[PDB]
Design a protein around this ligand. Sequence first.
Ligand SMILES: CCCOc1ccc(S(=O)(=O)N2CCN(C)CC2)cc1-c1nc(CC)c(Cl)c(=O)[nH]1
Ligand SMILES: [Mg+2]
Ligand SMILES: [Mg+2]
Ligand SMILES: [Mg+2]
Ligand SMILES: [Mg+2]
Ligand SMILES: [Mg+2]
Ligand SMILES: [Zn+2]
Length: 297
Amino acid sequence: ETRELQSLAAAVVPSAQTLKITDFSFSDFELSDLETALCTIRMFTDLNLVQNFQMKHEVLCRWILSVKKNYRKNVAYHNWRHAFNTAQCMFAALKAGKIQNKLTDLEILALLIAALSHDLDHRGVNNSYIQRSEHSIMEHHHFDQCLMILNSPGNQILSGLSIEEYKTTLKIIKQAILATDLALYIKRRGEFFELIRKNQFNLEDPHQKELFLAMLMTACDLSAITKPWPIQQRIAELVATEFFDQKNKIPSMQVGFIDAICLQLYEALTHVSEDCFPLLDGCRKNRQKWQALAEQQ
Ligand SMILES: CCCOc1ccc(S(=O)(=O)N2CCN(C)CC2)cc1-c1nc(CC)c(Cl)c(=O)[nH]1
Ligand SMILES: [Mg+2]
Ligand SMILES: [Mg+2]
Ligand SMILES: [Mg+2]
Ligand SMILES: [Mg+2]
Ligand SMILES: [Mg+2]
Ligand SMILES: [Zn+2]
């Protein structure tokens, strides 16, 4: 054991409501690492994951500490906090967004783990340890890092699954993490948009289900863009720090990013579940804000 594990295992886990992890407008700026750790336990708990898969408290805690440890603090945006926020957005979409009832337990288990693990060991959009020797290169590496952790002694939060359940969950996890490659999202989204507009969308079809999960991953991954203005400015500042340093051109970049990538996604997601409207809403409000700024710059 480490001190950190000891403290985390021994701590009381406040409720979902006390932790605010059900709010789409959630922010982690004022939280310590330990506090994000507790939030994460609460997520697995209220999703019924500890229950239905018999996770041992000490194993979950060690797992989360392992996941956090394998992000780099030295990377301004792509770090544990971003991973943690992606998972909190998944949680909020499942509960407040009422998507939980559209999915199986194994899908839910896999999305949470995928959300937390999808950028593992990221070195910043600039850094180029993609050699070699020459596709979703980063995402494959994030998934390897995830599997490694899931297989570490003391960390095996899936031990309680049968082999069948386990194989299935692993495949879903892998797909979810690969889905976070924006290049995949752009190739796949057309089909998702067609289905929605032709009123054809059907989650009971395995193919369409898998496509939705992919889209849900992207939605959560990009969710900083949906946050209240003061918070989104701060995050945008971290992103900029990573992109450029590891400035009035920035407001129009954000507008372009919102137009090209974000709006349609959150519009589609709201069609699937009207209770995910808050994401669409916050994204629009942020477009106002950035546009206004761009017109002075
Ligand atoms: C404010 C700093 C600049 O912000 C951006 C500028 C450009 C673009 S992009 O989509 O046109 N660009 C195309 C090339 N590709 C390699 C990288 C992405 C994205 C952002 C942007 N992305 C994210 C998602 C990571 C968040 Cl969360 C964010 O806030 N801002
Ligand atoms: Mg809210
Ligand atoms: Mg701290
Ligand atoms: Mg079920
Ligand atoms: Mg990524
Ligand atoms: Mg063991
Ligand atoms: Zn990400």
